[PDB]
Amino acid sequence: EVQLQQSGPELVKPGASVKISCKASGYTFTDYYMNWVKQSHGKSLEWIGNINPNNGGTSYNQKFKGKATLTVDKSSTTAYMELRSLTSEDSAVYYCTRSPVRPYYFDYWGQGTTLTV
């Protein structure tokens, strides 16, 4: 009923950059946080950051201070997160998901794309 689209994988060379989109289909785009989260190959999940679609605000992780930056657009219904300083240790699958304000659980996730190096 509610699907979260995402971008496709890409053989990114060490040094280049890549961004992944997200589409909130089924529920309104600007009524819950659009969180991002990472997990390495056969490892645990790592939160990337939070974004506010209504005003473009964001709150990124401390392990991705300058490492990652996120943007959103309620006119095109996208969620552009910018990933810079890519390597092999930081190249794995990423997830886009929704979350309301202060129960902070991730209800619906995207299909999941892998940024392999």
Add this chain to the structure above:
Amino acid sequence: GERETWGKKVDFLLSVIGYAVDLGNVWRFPYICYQNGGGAFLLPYTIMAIFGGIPLFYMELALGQYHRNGCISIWRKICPIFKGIGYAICIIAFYIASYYNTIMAWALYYLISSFTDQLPWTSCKNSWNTGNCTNYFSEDNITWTLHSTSPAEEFYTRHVLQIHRSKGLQDLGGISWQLALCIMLIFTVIYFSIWKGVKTSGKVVWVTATFPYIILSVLLVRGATLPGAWRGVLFYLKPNWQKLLETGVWIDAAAQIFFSLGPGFGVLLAFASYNKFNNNCYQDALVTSVVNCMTSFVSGFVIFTVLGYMAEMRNEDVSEVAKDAGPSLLFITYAEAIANMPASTFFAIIFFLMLITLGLDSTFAGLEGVITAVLDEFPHVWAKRRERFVLAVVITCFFGSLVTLTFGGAYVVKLLEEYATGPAVLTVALIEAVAVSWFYGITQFCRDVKEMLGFSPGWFWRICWVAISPLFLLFIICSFLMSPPQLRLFQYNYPYWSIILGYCIGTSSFICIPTYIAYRLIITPGTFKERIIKSITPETP
């Protein structure tokens, strides 16, 4: 001569202690302490108090006690080239009497509305609240929309403020009537309390400045019993030695200690001008600084144990609910907290009474200081009818504050708070300290201090008077002048034209100091050397 002293020494001590404490010891100190360092914030705060606030406090106190004149009539006998300090201080006091009194008006409205068994913010079943209602949790089943607001937040943004009808800062919306009536009442109280002078101001401070402490003790005893009231205390006492490394923490501590002790302003001086001559103004300054620090500490305790109780009832990590930087922390969060406790009515009444009596004494002290200044400056056309011109200055503050009593008055009060105060008062205090220490002579000041009470202070006080407090003040001014703040309020971002307006209001008081240095030499003209030596020499009584 006609120096109207106080009834007792404890009277002046209570008056100056009341001038010290204000809302800023409740809404600012705990928030800034949590943001900048957490529990470890006490070390830079105490350091900058010992080095930055106490020295200037004691210096201006002893100066006003010795010379026995206002903050404008003292420059005739200190440094006539810097008589604009008094005019700039009157302008700053006008700005404060304009913006600060709106907080008191809101608190009085909250008080008069809280007289109901069902608090107006414990449930949004009213006309003002819209469909975006989400009542207090009481459970974890409910989900929160990104635009969902609590009933107390809705009450604060729609009924007591009526800010939803603000389609832009370019207009105001219209002056409300309830807030206008509350501010009329509070200004009538101020006028009927400061009409005679320190004789009745000291009688009203006896209940005005002592009432906040009993309410604070009651609230602390309550916070010592609430469920989960230790989480907030732990967050308030959890040190962060890594955050202390940053310079922003030290800047915040310095700004907080300055705008809490309020040194180098012109109210301590105007009060000590009515004090006795041989009085021990050193012990008074020490005990006032200590009691102000302890009041801020106890207020941090009570506020953060209340937020800890809230984070226990609601979700924890008090930073999630303590996102409002400003008086909303007392108006939104504390309202929710008191609403969740049983018998919320009595606690609401005592808390809003604590707020109103924390504002009352401070406004009394500021207006009394500016009135004493203008009276000491013109003792012939004035000082013959002292009960007169006080109604005039009260109507002046009212006409200046009507622009803040509109529907979108929160933006105006925030703009006046964060821009019309800081740099102006800091530069004024800096150049005043330079005038008193460097221009007037540190040795002369120490000799007058010795002759006044009976002993000269040590070399440490001299170091803090000549080098430590000047570098402290200039550090603050160069920190605040190198970071234009893009402040917001309720997601209402301020454009650059608002920043230009704030900068203009800021310098709208300092420029009165070059005004005097310009239009004073028109009566004593001549060469440059004779003018530069006549401007520095004081008056000869």
Add this chain to the structure above:
Amino acid sequence: DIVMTQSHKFMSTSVGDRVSITCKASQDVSTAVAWYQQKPGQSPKLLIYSASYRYTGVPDRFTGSGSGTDFTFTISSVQAEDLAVYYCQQHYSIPRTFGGGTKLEI
């Protein structure tokens, strides 16, 4: 930060037995704990949030409790379709973090 430690990554049992896993928190957390289910290859699936409330789209088989530091995620009569790496996530503080999980054997 507030590290999320759980039971061993392999502690499990056969089909049709009482499965109980824990999730220890470095800081005392009242109820700010969630539980997601990571089926092999796909995205995590939310089952329970606030440590006692199962999100919509849940079978009554999944249960869980706990408070303070140790949160008891209990479930009995496990079926052949409910074996996945169950992650433990907390709502406590930013930056939020997940857990490690545990493989199901057998």
